[PDB]
Every structure is written in structure tokens, then in C-alpha cells.
Amino acid sequence: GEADCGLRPLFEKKSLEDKTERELLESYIDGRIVEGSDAEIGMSPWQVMLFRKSPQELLCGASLISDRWVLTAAHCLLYPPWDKNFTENDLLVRIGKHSRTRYERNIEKISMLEKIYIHPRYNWRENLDRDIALMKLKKPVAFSDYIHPVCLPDRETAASLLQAGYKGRVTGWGNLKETWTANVGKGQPSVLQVVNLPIVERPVCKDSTRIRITDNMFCAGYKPDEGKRGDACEGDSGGPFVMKSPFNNRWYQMGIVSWGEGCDRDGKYGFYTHVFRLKKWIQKVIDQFG
């Protein structure tokens, strides 16, 4: 539950580490052997799939923060320039999934949305400032080894974990690469994908794009001269950027995949909605409703 957030049933709770977890620790190299991008079963139990009912379509990612609340990006529900404006009945959330190409009856949970709450000051016409939304489930979902909530950070966790160079993890079923024409389509995985990336200094984030960035965002990604690569992409929006705290061994959702220009382009970085910066709103919503 709330108290049990961030501790994974199939990992921390069993004293097992996932394959790249150690890459997020200050002490690390990375050579020759590079681990796969396929997620290990149950490695992101807070992972949520935002699904359009008809025509069937995997819209975005999201995350489970309580037995009744799901967090996502606002632009996945509302973005006028693409004539996007979904309402509760237009979709559902799929929780506890691993493969997206089949229904996983033993671990998967499908929840009907009771109400969507988009940040009233979500700035879609300009720079996606405050790109964040909450979705209250009609019924609380039960936890299991595959469905467990992630923790949200507080002021200090954010101040200590969000430092240039520190790495976080992004997960999702979105596109595997930027394509040459928007039309080429979607190159999608069948299994949840994972990538770990470093937070980059604000001045670099700011200088990397002409879009006006705000304090409600942060960017992550490797720099041209860093050699490693990786990034979030189309379809990943709403997914979590998590960080494991060395202080208590719990996973914290520091961000939400929000935007970027292209995918994995050199000198370009993925931008994420800064979760702590928008926590009073999250809290007001959860405390006022349900």
C-alpha cells in the first residue's frame, strides 16, 4: 500500500536485484557486456498501460501510485493540436502486464476509469508545462507480485536524487526508434522495455531546445561525447522515470515521460514532468476526491 510503496514483490521483498539496478549506483563502468532492454518479469510492477478501447490502441504509459490512483501525462488525454480529448469511457488501464501482444489472465488487471483529472494549468499550446494528469479507478485494484505502487518523492528526496549525472530508469511499450517519416509507423516491442539514463544539467537541457523549458520539467539522456545512447519515444509518454533511493532501498517516481524532439537524436534530450514540483496538486486531488 502507501507504506509499502516502492518495494517490489519479486525483487526487494525477496532480496533479489534486477539485472541493471547496479548501473544506477554511483559506482559503475559498463563495458563489453551490455544487458538487454527487455524488462524482467515484475521489475516495474507500478507500470500501467493507458489503452484506447476502440479502435484498440496502446496510447501511453502510466504508473500506479495507490490502489485507486493512476498517474500519467496530460497530453495523452488532452492535446488539441492532434485533436485529442479522451474521456473516461473512451479508455481503460491495463495493470500488471509484461507482454502487450496478448491478454495475460493470471497477472493482468483491467480497470475502468471513474474520473480523469487534468492539471488545470497544463500548458498544451506552448511547451507542455505541467504535463500531468490523474485517473481515479472506479474500484481499488488488488496488489500482487505484478501490481505494486511506486513511491512519490518529497522535497528532499527530489533535491538529493535529482542531480546531474545521477541515473534513473524509464520503462514502456512505445516505439523502438525514431522513423524517417511519421508515416513509416510504429516499431513496437512485445515486451516492456527498459533504459537507464542520466539526469543532465539544466543549462544543457535549456540550450538543447528552442522550446521554453520550465522548472516543472527536467531532462535526461546521454550527451554526444558519452557513447552510451537511449531515450524514451512516441507511446512512452505517461511512463515513469524512477530512481532507487540509497537511503531506504525504495523506488521513487521522479518524473513522467513528457516530450522530446525526435528520439535519441544527438544533442537532444528527453523531457520529463517533474513530479515533486507538482505534488501539492496531486495531493489536493487525491485528498479532495475518492
Partner: protein
């Protein structure tokens, strides 16, 4: 999520891009052809039938080939955009009073392509799709439950699936107006729709495995409804039939189905719990 580098996965020959560029008017048509081939290749990959674990490597392999040629074109666009930018700058120094705006990378489109490139790209995707089809044939010989059904076999299997789903729909209709169980009913309907696929192009029940797993999924979804509402699953549920039970077209029939279904739930015992598809608890 982007993790891999597909920059050396293309079968296009290093020197092909330096050949004779094709006239811009004919170019546009060759680029659309390429776009279409990628769409078709990705579509074969996504076919529902292949969403089984046994096709994982055949798919990764085909995907790697498609992304590799996509990357070839994307890198060519990047190189050409850089040259375009310098040309635009020169154009401006020569027509300083011009108001034309420089295209952004996303508005730009490839301006240089040779037939060698087009033919090699085309051949590469074709060869990749062919290899995929062979890998698939081999896979299906060593796993009989993955072998495509003949049309008659598929029709029979699809009818069993649709019939089970229609019983599910009856349960859904019998409780969608029940304040106490409405949410469970609504999710039941939504889950039955999800596994079946879009009504206008549902997932084909094309082999023994899909017939078997779709049946178990449907049974499990119906059992989920009873487990969650705390009601008992009746041994007999009249399959929903639009021609006989449509809510608006055949109100009487609809009301009779709801009534008959609600009553059978009431008269059912809990024996069914010992035989569910899923483990509960």
C-alpha cells in the same frame, strides 16, 4: 523506448548513394513506395497470429531488418538536411529580400536518392520479409498448435469463441443496470471486447492455440465477474443474439434474457469455484 543502435543494420551498399540522383518529380513517388513497403513489413510483424512467444526471435530478426533500413533513410535525411541548411544560407545571401523560411528538419523531406538505393532498400525489405516467412514456416512445423487452420477449421473455432463471448455479453446485460454490480458488468464487457479485438476486424482464431487460449481467457473473464461480485456462475447461460435480444430492436427479448440470466445466477450453487481457469486467493 530506444536502446539499440541500428546504424549498421542496413543492406544498402556504401556507394549506392553517390550514383545518379533521380529527378525530383519521380523521387516523390519512389519515397512513397518505400514508405508503403515499411508499413506493409511492420504490418506483417504485428499480425495477431504471431504474438506468441515462439515467434519472438523471428520477429526481433525482422524488426532489426526493417529498423535498419529505416535508419538508413533517416540518416540520409539528416545528412541532406545539413547540406540543405547551408544551401538555404547561401540562397539568402543571394536573395536578401526574400521572405521564404527555412524548413525545419521535420518539414524537410529527402531530396537525394538513386535507383540503386531504392532498389537495394526494396530488395532488402523483401528479403527480410521472405526470411521471416521461412522462420515462421519452420516454427509452425515444430509446434502443431501454431499451424494455421484451414478456413473450415477456423470458421468452426471462431464460432465457438463468439458463442462463449455472447454468453459473456448476456451476463453483462443482466447486470449492467444493477446498482450493486454495475462496475463488474461494465469491466466484463470491456474485457470481453478487449480480448476479441475491434468488432470490425477481430483477432482471427487461426490455430489451435489461439482457440484454446481465447476460450480460457473468455471463461476466466466471466469467472472474474462472478468472483468479484460474489455471485455464483450458472451452468446455463443463453448466448446473446442481437437478432433476438437487442435492447432497442427487441426490448421484450432483451428483458426476457436479462430475467432468465438473473434467475439462473440466483439458482446457481458455488460448485463452479473448484473448477475455475484462474487461481483466486
Amino acid at each position: 523506448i530506444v536502446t539499440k543502435d541500428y546504424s549498421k543494420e542496413s543492406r544498402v551498399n556504401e556507394n549506392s548513394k553517390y550514383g545518379t540522383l533521380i529527378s525530383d518529380w519521380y523521387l516523390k513517388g519512389r519515397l512513397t513506395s518505400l514508405e508503403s513497403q515499411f508499413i506493409n513489413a511492420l504490418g506483417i510483424l504485428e499480425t495477431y497470429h504471431y504474438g506468441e512467444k515462439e515467434y519472438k526471435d523471428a520477429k526481433d530478426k525482422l524488426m532489426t531488418r526493417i529498423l535498419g533500413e529505416d535508419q538508413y533513410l533517416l540518416e540520409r535525411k539528416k545528412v541532406q538536411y545539413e547540406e540543405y541548411k547551408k544551401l538555404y544560407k547561401k540562397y539568402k545571401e543571394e536573395n536578401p529580400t526574400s521572405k521564404v523560411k527555412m524548413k525545419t528538419f521535420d518539414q524537410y523531406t529527402i531530396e537525394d536518392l538513386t535507383m540503386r538505393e531504392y532498389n537495394e532498400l526494396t530488395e532488402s525489405l523483401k528479403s527480410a520479409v521472405k526470411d521471416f516467412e521461412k522462420d515462421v514456416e519452420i516454427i509452425e512445423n515444430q509446434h502443431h498448435d501454431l499451424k494455421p487452420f484451414t478456413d473450415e477449421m477456423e470458421e468452426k473455432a471462431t464460432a465457438r469463441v463468439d458463442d462463449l463471448a455472447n454468453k459473456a455479453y448476456s451476463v453483462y446485460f443482466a447486470f449492467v443496470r444493477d446498482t450493486q454490480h454495475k462496475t463488474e458488468a461494465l469491466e466484463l464487457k470491456a474485457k470481453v471486447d478487449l480480448v476479441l479485438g475491434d468488432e470490425d476486424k477481430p483477432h482471427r482464431i487461426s490455430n489451435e492455440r489461439i482457440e484454446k487460449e481465447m476460450i480460457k481467457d473468455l471463461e476466466s473473464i466471466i469467472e472474474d465477474f462472478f468472483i468479484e461480485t460474489g455471485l455464483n456462475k450458472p451452468d446455463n447461460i443463453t448466448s446473446y443474439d442481437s437478432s433476438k435480444h437487442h435492447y432497442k430492436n427487441h426490448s421484450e427479448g432483451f428483458e426476457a434474457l436479462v430475467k432468465e440470466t438473473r434467475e439462473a445466477v440466483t439458482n446457481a450453487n458455488d460448485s463452479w469455484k473448484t473448477k475455475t481457469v484462474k487461481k483466486y486467493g
